[PDB]
C-alpha cells in the first residue's frame, strides 16, 4: 500500500537535500504529508525513530523542514535509548538552532515515560546541566532535570552553579523547584523555605496532546507531624569514613522509596525511622513495622509526643478551649482506628484516662472516650478499681439510660479484649490469680446491672444490654 | 434499630479484619523466608579487599589519564614569545590545587594566551579570582 512509500521517503531522507529540482521538494513535502497521516492514524515504529531524529538534528534540510519533523514525531512504540544518546550528541555538536532545540527539549519532556531504559539517560546528567547557561532553554531544561534528578547527582559545585544562576536572574519558579528538590536531596548544603501548591512549572499542553490521548487509547488494550526523613544530625561530626561503607555493606533503606507493600516486604528488617514518630500514626506501612518492634526509645518518644498532644488538645482538662471541637474528635477517631490495629493500646491513653476522668461530665466525647476505655491493659481489679471504676460508677448511677447502655457495651468490649489476651498466655502471677480479677469484674458489673434495674424501674431496653453481656 | 446498626458495624469490621489478616499472613511468610535465607548463609580478607579496590581504582585512573592525554594531544596541538600547550596549563592548575589547598590561585602569564584561558573559563573548568582577574584557580570538583 503506502508502507513502501514510507520506506522510500525515509530512504530519500537518508540521501540528503536537493539543489536544483525544487519540485522534488514539493514531492518530499507530499512525503511529509504521508508521514504525518500515518503518524496520526497509527503512529511510527521504533526502527525509523533514530534515523528521523538524527536527520532532524543534523541540520541538512533547514529549519523550515526540521520544525515539523519534531512535531510529527509520534512514538507509537517504545523509544530506544541509543537514539536519545545520538540526539544528545548531535545537540552537543552545535549545528542546531534555538527553536529546534526548544522543540526537542519539549518533546523529550513530554515523551519521557515512553522510553524503556532510563539509566543511560541519567548517565548524561552533566550534558543536560551544562545547558542551563542559556536563558532561552532554562525552563525546559529545569523541568527535565526535575525528573532526571537522583541522589548521586546532587553535588556542591552544581549547588554553587544554581546559586549563582539565581543571583544573576532572581526568583524564577523553574529554579525554585529545582532548588527545593536539591535541598530535599541534600539538606546539609542548601536551606530553602518556599512560600505558597502554586504552579511552578508551566502546565502548557504540548503539540502532541492529541497524540498523547492517541497513545493512551492505543495502550488501553497540623496536629500530626508531617512525614520527613531522619534528622541530618546523624554522622554530623565525622573525621573519616566508617569501615562499613568502605566495604560496601548493607547500610539502610531510604524512607522516600517506601511506597508500596512489596517494597516493605523486601526491606522489613532494615528501615529508616522518621524524625518525628507522630507521623507514623497515619501510615499503614509504618504501622505494619511498629506492630512488632518493642523498642524502648521509639516507645518513649511516641509516649511523650502523644501525652503532650492529648494534654494540650483536650477540651475540659487544664484549659477551657472549646475552639478545638471536631478536631479532638477526629484525632481520637484516628487513635482508635490505629489502636484497633496492633491489638493493643498505648500508655499515653491510659494516663490521659486516669488524669481527665474525675473532671469528665459524660457528654463531650462519650463515644471516643468509652471506646478508649475498652483498650486498657490487663491488671488486677483491686488496683485499677479506685482509679477508673469508682468514677465510672459515680457517673453511672446519676446519668440517663443511654449512658448506662454505653458503659455496659464498653465493659463487654473490655471483658472480650481481656479474655482474648489471656487465652494466648496459657499456650506459652499464675492463672489462679488471673481468674480472680475477671471474676471480680463480672461480680462488679452484675451488681451494677442489678442496681440499674432497680433504679430505672425495670426497663427492657437495659435488660437487653444486660443479657447481651451475659451472652458473652 | 440498635440491632440493625450493630449488624452493619459487625459486617464492616469483619471485612476490615479479613483484609488485615491477609496482609499480616503475607508479612509473616516473607519474614520467615528471609530469616531462613539468612540462617542458611580475620583481617586478611579485609586487607585483600582493600588491595583489590586500590588496584581497580589505580587501573581506572591510569586508563582515564592516558585517554585524556591522547585526546588533548590529538585535538589541541601546539598553537603556531612562545606559548605552552593546554595540557601543561591543566597540569599546573591541578598541581597547585592539590599541593596548596588554601591558596590554589595562579597568576596569568604570557604563555597562557587569551584563547585557552577563555575556553577554560567558559567551560567552567577555571575561575577568576574575585578581586583581581590576573589570578585563576581550578574548580574543586571533589568537594
Amino acid at each position: 500500500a503506502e508502507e513502501d512509500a514510507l520506506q522510500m521517503a525515509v530512504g530519500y531522507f537518508e540521501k540528503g537535500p536537493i539543489k536544483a529540482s525544487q519540485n522534488k521538494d514539493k514531492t518530499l513535502e507530499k512525503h511529509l504529508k504521508t508521514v504525518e497521516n500515518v503518524a496520526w492514524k497509527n503512529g511510527l515504529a521504533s526502527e525509523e525513530i533514530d534515523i528521523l531524529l538524527n536527520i532532524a538534528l543534523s541540520g541538512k534540510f533547514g529549519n523550515a523542514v526540521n520544525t515539523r519533523i519534531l512535531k510529527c514525531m509520534i512514538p507509537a512504540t517504545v523509544i530506544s535509548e541509543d537514539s536519545v544518546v545520538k540526539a544528545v550528541s548531535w545537540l552537543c555538536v552545535g549545528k542546531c538552532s534555538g527553536s529546534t532545540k526548544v522543540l526537542f527539549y519539549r518533546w523529550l519532556v513530554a515523551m519521557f515515560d515512553f522510553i524503556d531504559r532510563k539509566e543511560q539517560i541519567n548517565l548524561l546528567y552533566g550534558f543536560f546541566f551544562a545547558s542551563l547557561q542559556d536563558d532561552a532553554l532554562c525552563p525546559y531544561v529545569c523541568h527535565l532535570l526535575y525528573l532526571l534528578t537522583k541522589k548521586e547527582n546532587v553535588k556542591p559545585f552544581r549547588v554553587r552553579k544554581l546559586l549563582d544562576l539565581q543571583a544573576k536572574m532572581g526568583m524564577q519558579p523553574h529554579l525554585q523547584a529545582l532548588l527545593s528538590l536539591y535541598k530535599f536531596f541534600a539538606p546539609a548544603l542548601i536551606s530553602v523555605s518556599l512560600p505558597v501548591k502554586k504552579i511552578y512549572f508551566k502546565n502548557s499542553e504540548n503539540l502532541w496532546k492529541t497524540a498523547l490521548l492517541a497513545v493512551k487509547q492505543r495502550n488501553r488494550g497540623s496536629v500530626i507531624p508531617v512525614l520527613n526523613s531522619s534528622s541530618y544530625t546523624k554522622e554530623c561530626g565525622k573525621k573519616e569514613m566508617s569501615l562499613s561503607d568502605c566495604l560496601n555493606r548493607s547500610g539502610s533503606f531510604p524512607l522516600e522509596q517506601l511506597q508500596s507493600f512489596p517494597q516493605l516486604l523486601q526491606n522489613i528488617h532494615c528501615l529508616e525511622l522518621p524524625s518525628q514518630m507522630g507521623s507514623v500514626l497515619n501510615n499503614s506501612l509504618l504501622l505494619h513495622y511498629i506492630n512488632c518492634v518493642r523498642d524502648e526509645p521509639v516507645l518513649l518518644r511516641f509516649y511523650y509526643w502523644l501525652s503532650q498532644t492529648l494534654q494540650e488538645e483536650c477540651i475540659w482538662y487544664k484549659v477551657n478551649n472549646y475552639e478545638h471541637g471536631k478536631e479532638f474528635t477526629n484525632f481520637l477517631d484516628t487513635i482508635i482506628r490505629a489502636e484497633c490495629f496492633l491489638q493493643e493500646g498505648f500508655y499515653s491513653c491510659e494516663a490521659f484516662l486516669y488524669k481527665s476522668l474525675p473532671l469528665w461530665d459524660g457528654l463531650c466525647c462519650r463515644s471516643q472516650f468509652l471506646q478508649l476505655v475498652s483498650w486498657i491493659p490487663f491488671s488486677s481489679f483491686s488496683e485499677v478499681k479506685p482509679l477508673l471504676f469508682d468514677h465510672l460508677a459515680q457517673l453511672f448511677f446519676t446519668s440517663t439510660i443511654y449512658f448506662k447502655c454505653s458503659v455496659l457495651q464498653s465493659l463487654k468490649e473490655l471483658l472480650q479484649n481481656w479474655l482474648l489476651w489471656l487465652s494466648m498466655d496459657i499456650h506459652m502471677t499464675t492463672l489462679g490469680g488471673s481468674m480472680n480479677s475477671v471474676s471480680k469484674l463480672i461480680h462488679y458489673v452484675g451488681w451494677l446491672s442489678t442496681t440499674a434495674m432497680r433504679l430505672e424501674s425495670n426497663n427492657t431496653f437495659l435488660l437487653h444490654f444486660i443479657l447481651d453481656f451475659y451472652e458473652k | 434499630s440498635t440491632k440493625e446498626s450493630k449488624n452493619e458495624k459487625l459486617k464492616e469490621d469483619l471485612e476490615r479484619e479479613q483484609r488485615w489478616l491477609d496482609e499480616q499472613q503475607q508479612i509473616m511468610e516473607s519474614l520467615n523466608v528471609l530469616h531462613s535465607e539468612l540462617k542458611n548463609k580475620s583481617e586478611s580478607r579485609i586487607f585483600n579487599e582493600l588491595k583489590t579496590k586500590m588496584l581497580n581504582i589505580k587501573e581506572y585512573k591510569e586508563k582515564l589519564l592516558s585517554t585524556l592525554g591522547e585526546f588533548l594531544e590529538d585535538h589541541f596541538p601546539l598553537p603556531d614569545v612562545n606559548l605552552i600547550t593546554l595540557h601543561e596549563m591543566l597540569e599546573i592548575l591541578i598541581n597547585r590545587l592539590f599541593d596548596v589547598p588554601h591558596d590554589p590561585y595562579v597568576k596569568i602569564s604570557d604563555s597562557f594566551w587569551p584563547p585557552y584561558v577563555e575556553l577554560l573559563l567558559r567551560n567552567g573548568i577555571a575561575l577568576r579570582h574575585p578581586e583581581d582577574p590576573t589570578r585563576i584557580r581550578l574548580e574543586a570538583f571533589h568537594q
Binding site: 463515644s367 457495651q409 | 440498635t2 446498626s5 458495624k9
Partner: peptide, 12 residues
Amino acid sequence: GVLAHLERLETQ
C-alpha cells in the same frame, strides 16, 4: 456504630 446510635437517640 452502637455508641453513635445511642448518642443520636439521646440528642433527639
